[model samples]
Target: VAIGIDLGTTYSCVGICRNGVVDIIANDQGNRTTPSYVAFTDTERLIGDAAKNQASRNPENTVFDAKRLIGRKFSETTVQSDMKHWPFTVKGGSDGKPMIEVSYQGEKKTFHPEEISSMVLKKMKEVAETYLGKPVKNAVITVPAYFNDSQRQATKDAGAIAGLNVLRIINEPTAAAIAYGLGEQNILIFDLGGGTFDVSLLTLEDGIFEVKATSGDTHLGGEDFDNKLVNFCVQDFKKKNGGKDVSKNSKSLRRLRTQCEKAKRVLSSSAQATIEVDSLFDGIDYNVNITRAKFEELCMDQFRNTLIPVEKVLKDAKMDKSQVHEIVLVGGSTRIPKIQQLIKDFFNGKEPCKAINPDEAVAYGAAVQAAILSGDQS
Candidate 1:
């Protein structure tokens, strides 16, 4: 059997087409999505939620968001800047590409981003195999629209390392469009992933989906919004604690990031949320009440950044916003109310489509592609 995979930066998901029905395959824990994390211990390794659960306790050994560093050279300015934020050591590999170094069983070892990503892909493969009751060997994987050729190739390599044949590397926006179903109309796909933003214009005609234009900022996404809140909390903490900086404390920072993510989710529905951390740093508790307004204020720039790409893609396609028949919001970041409103405003107050779950649509579409490739009509 063949499956489709969305190897996202923050989470990964797998889906299979059964009898022409695309169904998302849940992990061993029965969750539709799995945390894209890996933790290395002295004598063991953990993947998915297990790895994420240990992040705060073992910040230096837990690796997350490997997608950001995959296929990137250490000498790149982006890699150099991002390395400072990660708790684990990211250094130059033999080929000058980024390598994650960690202590394993008292021995220092390094891992390529591809190797780390393969673990997540392997986990998804196992899930699909278990659900299908057979050995699934081929997959169509989705990637950010802006990923360069090297990054795309690296994703394929990861699939191979995980023992799956990579059938195709589809752009995320196109995949979402497919999941939304075939149509004879113009549509815009706004994909805001964990670490990247993508906007694309597509036309569905005669049972074919063609991407007319696409644009995005690889560095922009939900993580930037989380970091904004993280910085706010840090500044507030420093003021209350006599200018003490906890940014260098990996464990404390991890805890703060987790709290900020929770706050972000809560603020999505409620007008305000409280961020509380017990013994956050140096035996001091951190507590802050943040309103949805304040959170949006802090992340307004990031929300605005997404619009630039939207405009660019529209301009590239030479299509006016009025000419678009539908707008599809994809990825977890699109759940934020402010983002939804901003998108609505940009499209002249037309509500964007939400027929598919933001998290699963890409993988579901990939399953459709997988079925086509495997010659499975039902």
Candidate 2:
């Protein structure tokens, strides 16, 4: 079977499509999407879920979110701003590009962003091969439409390094369109993932998925929402303890970040969620209960900002709201109820298409494209 890979910033997924198969390949961990994380230990390299599990303990050697550094200049404003928050070191490499430095096998190692990406890509390939019960050689990879020539080429190169023939590299918006295949009309894909937000206005007709325009906040995403919640807890702790900030402690902060993220997930499906971290900082226990209403209030800005790109897509595409006949959601962050309502309101209460799984839609489209290009009818 031909596989399509959604190479996301924080998580990646693989899908296989053909005449007899319409499935998303699950990782060995039984996850629909594998985390886009890689860690190097003295004994071995870890990818996906295991990698994410050990990240707090090995923050420096475990690399995640390297997608932001790929194909970017070391001195670029975006790269420089993001560097401070990154636990790993990213120094200037030759020709002004960024080089990530990490420890591997008892040695200090530096790697290009392409190598890290290829490692993730290789892991995705391994999962597909293991689950498909066959040797898979061809793939269609999906990338953001905002990707420039360098980013696109770098992604293809990563695929090649991962030991697969990348038959096609399609824009994510177009890929999502291919999966839905809805009436061959205008599409609005509001893709909100862990690391970034993307909104694309596209046209579908005669099997041509044309990307009319793309716009998004480069830094806004689920992580930002998590950060807001994390700060709330930290501030609450300080106030209770008479101003001893736990944010300065890396270990505590790491655990809090983990717990806060879990709370964010819990808040997604419930009316109230509680975060309890035993000995979160300096032998002091921490617990906070957040109602969904409060969670929405705390992260209201993040939710509202999701609309900017929607408006921009319409403005840039020079099309009216009514022209968007279908709206598709992508990425895990789209699970938030407020985001759905905001999108619906923006489109005059027309419900955004939710029939397709948000996390797998991009990869599913890539699989469709892979099948199309490879003639994989079987």
**Model-by-model lDDT, in order?**
0.89, 0.88
Candidate 1 segments whose C-alpha is farther than 4 A from its true place: 238-245
TM-score of each: 0.91, 0.96
Mind giving the per-residue lDDT tens digits that candidate 2 earns over 316-369?
989999888989999888998888888899889998887788989999888988
Residue-level error in angstroms, candidate 2, position 199: 0.6
Residue 334 Cα positional deviation in candidate 2, in Å, after optimal superposition: 0.8
Model 1: worst 10 consecutive residues (lDDT sum): 175-184
